[PDB]
A paper describes a structure:
The NAD(P)+-dependent succinate semialdehyde dehydrogenase (SSADH) Sad is a member of the ALDH superfamily and oxidizes succinate semialdehyde (SSA) to succinate. In microorganisms, SSADHs operate in the degradation of various nitrogen-containing compounds such as putrescine or arginine, where they prevent the accumulation of the toxic SSA intermediate. Our results show that Sad is a surprisingly flexible enzyme that is not only able to detoxify succinate semialdehyde and glutarate semialdehyde but can also functionally substitute erythrose 4-phosphate dehydrogenase in pyridoxal 5′-phosphate (PLP) biosynthesis and glyceraldehyde 3-phosphate dehydrogenase (as well as phosphoglycerate kinase) in glycolysis under physiological conditions. We show that Sad, which primarily functions in the detoxification of succinate semialdehyde in various degradation pathways, does not only accept closely related substrates, but also converts phosphorylated sugars as a side reactivity.
Residue numbers in the entry:
A (entry chain B), B (entry chain A): 3 to 462
Write the structure that this text describes.
Amino acid sequence: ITPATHAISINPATGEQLSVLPWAGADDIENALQLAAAGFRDWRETNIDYRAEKLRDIGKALRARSEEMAQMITREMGKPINQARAEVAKSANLCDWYAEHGPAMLKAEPTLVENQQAVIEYRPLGTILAIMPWNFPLWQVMRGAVPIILAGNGYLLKHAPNVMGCAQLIAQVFKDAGIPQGVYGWLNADNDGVSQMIKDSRIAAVTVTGSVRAGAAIGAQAGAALKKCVLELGGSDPFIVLNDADLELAVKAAVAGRYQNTGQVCAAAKRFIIEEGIASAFTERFVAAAAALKMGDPRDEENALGPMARFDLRDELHHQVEKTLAQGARLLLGGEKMAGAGNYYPPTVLANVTPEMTAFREEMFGPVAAITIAKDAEHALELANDSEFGLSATIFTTDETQARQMAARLECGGVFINGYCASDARVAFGGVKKSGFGRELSHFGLHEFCNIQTVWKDRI
Amino acid sequence: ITPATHAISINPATGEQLSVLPWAGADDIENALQLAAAGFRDWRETNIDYRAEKLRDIGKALRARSEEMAQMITREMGKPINQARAEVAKSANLCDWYAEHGPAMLKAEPTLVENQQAVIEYRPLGTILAIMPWNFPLWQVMRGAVPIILAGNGYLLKHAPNVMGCAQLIAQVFKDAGIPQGVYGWLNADNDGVSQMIKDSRIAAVTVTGSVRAGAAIGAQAGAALKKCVLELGGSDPFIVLNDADLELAVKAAVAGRYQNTGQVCAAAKRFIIEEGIASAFTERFVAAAAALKMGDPRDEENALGPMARFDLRDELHHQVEKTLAQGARLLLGGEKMAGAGNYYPPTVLANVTPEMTAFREEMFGPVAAITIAKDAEHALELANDSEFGLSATIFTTDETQARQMAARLECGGVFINGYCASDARVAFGGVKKSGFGRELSHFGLHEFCNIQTVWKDRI
Ligand SMILES: NC(=O)c1ccc[n+]([C@@H]2O[C@H](COP(=O)([O-])OP(=O)(O)OC[C@H]3O[C@@H](n4cnc5c(N)ncnc54)[C@H](O)[C@@H]3O)[C@@H](O)[C@H]2O)c1
Ligand SMILES: NC(=O)c1ccc[n+]([C@@H]2O[C@H](COP(=O)([O-])OP(=O)(O)OC[C@H]3O[C@@H](n4cnc5c(N)ncnc54)[C@H](O)[C@@H]3O)[C@@H](O)[C@H]2O)c1
């Protein structure tokens, strides 16, 4: 069994093979598209309040399998078990939040046209094809699926090939909730199967969460097929610390921001840009706090980090570390693959990272922090924006005026001032530049895949 | 002077060559990209109220050359002079409308996050590349340029090669208004130049109004370069008349909707779908009302129709008519090229048009009406959605409940009930399916090319 024929699950903590699943054939793809078409046809006619109730049924079904879901996440991609439980809880609360606030976001919108002649309606678009990654096997799916389905659309998941056990579990949860299989479906399609579905008329639009290379390859096919796409393609988020900052809170938020999910977060704090006056105190405190993180078996709740999900990606990450050191960076912590059958990489800190270095120009999708010195606040802003990515950012300073001014000049989709960066249903999510385009969550995730339809009566 | 080397303007009323313009070279492309990046860098730092005032300056500069602009539009693409003056007036009013209402649409947006810790901000994205067509040489530019610039973005126009006289005049209007260097620019680029700019990092996003073939070609490039794009690619709008409709008003709106701008409108009434009970009366009234339209020299205000804009497109439209007649349709009016040096095509009506015929499946971008009989309202809805396009639609019926129900099932971005289909700053514009995606005008045209940015303080 090889990836050329099957999707393979391997426990990254032990290296043992878990499951295999062959790619969907031509009959599977045709059957999936037929049921998605029939499902949307009936789902688009349901009441908005009925769909809001079905969202609550999803949240109830998810909580009824919360531990079964979290264990599957931890087993397949190595997430610490309490972070997998938090992912389940966050995904279930998302169902309840959209159930309460979603309908009001989908109400018809009045216009300034006289005599109440014109309103704006949010109509369903069709079946949305979703390409999702492995770092949050449940949350990445629910973040789009919940608002997409509430808007009357269908959702067809093409999950990452190393988390198909999570994909089947999610499908079972939707089945438990009474969601018709044409409204929520899934396929184990290879890249050619995705290309075929993008060209198929039964797919209305596409959404992609993954690498820059995956978004560029899929975004070109969606544009060629005249399908709207939303791309969320990770980032290299800057974490700015000025001299007047709450240093202790900044270090806590820096450590959590970088090493959450063993570093494998799109909006993780990756480029730490510290003003020169406070850089020595920050660096020493950051290394001390990163060194206090326990790493090991993700089923053991005492471990803050588990193994990295993919063996090839740990090799890639370590190669990036070696290149950055060879270019002139200094190693302050970790920086070597752990011996054993597990895919473990320890918390790592690189200092003296200049903008020409690998760890500054590429996404470090693992437990490796890069620390860059800034001459002043203007240099820090320039350093923050000197990146191909632009998903999110953090600024730590007690001068809230300068913080508001820097936020307005940061080329990214989210700015956190003196706090922990995270995605939340109540705020928009998504970035600019090579991080992609399109916004998720809040009312943005509801409207991105809606036919915004003007209805105008008696225009005479 | 071959189109392979020059952009050529030809007066369609006479056939005389007006002007030539060589394609921009590599230097000209690089120059404009540099000035656009420099212009945006300074424009994004200005106050919103300053830019709103400059919008009022654009409207003043446009009205100051209103007759010069309208005569240029009529001369280069053949629009009747009164419709060209109306285009100028509608474009200037768009400047004042966004100047008044735009700033409020760009204010920070509150969230449900407790204690007012998180707001949504609408930041500029960058320089927007615009690919525009010849049917509304001014309005198509202003519909995007006014909101795009107001939100702090830059605007780089690649106009259609037969209306470069209009493009230069438009640039003179922005220069008269004092719009800075690089905020509004334009290039006489060929298709390779557009490809070069899409791949360039100084272009943040693309917008395209034109054919389906152009949108698929440009949209594929935008996705491959990870640039968001908005595509408005014309349509084959259905015009449904049920048995209980106000026949007199329906006929007036049908004629106005089809033969406006000599039929060269993306949201024109193209496929007339009439219930069998009223079909005979509607058809006879439509032929008689279309026959009362005067056609001739577009500088003469008595003429409701001018010549078609492009000689090759009249040849293609007539080929579409000949194919539809050969497929079984009946000719009720017009249906033959006018002899002479002008590019004149008379008002044309085709009856017995079935869904398998050319005039039903392709866009008839000229003064040719296609009439299809529907058995009942359910059949009319099926006939309306049986199309690759989906820009807009019209329903005429005194049963307003049935009209609203059909509007919810019409696969298009705009539905007009008992009125005249048109675009308006106060409502959304844009469609679905092969008509493209994304919305223009109102707050949609402002937000499509904004960096929607979450700003969240003290998330602890
Ligand atoms: N949160 C994120 O944005 C995120 C998540 C995981 C990985 N990544 C980035 O991607 C890197 C590699 O991890 P990865 O290999 O899993 O990313 P990936 O893009 O290759 O996998 C992401 C998803 O896209 C799909 N995909 C990839 N190429 C495709 C194609 N040509 N056609 C159709 N579908 C395609 C994959 O099957 C998967 O479902 C990581 O190191 C990280 O930099 C980002
Ligand atoms: N309002 C509209 O949506 C609209 C306007 C004009 C034409 N059309 C449709 O298109 C048909 C032909 O008219 P047209 O020739 O002007 O359409 P067109 O698409 O060829 O021209 C539209 C614009 O797109 C540009 N363009 C086209 N192909 C391109 C490419 N490969 N790369 C870069 N830029 C490209 C053109 O230069 C022009 O500026 C019409 O008969 C009608 O069906 C629609």
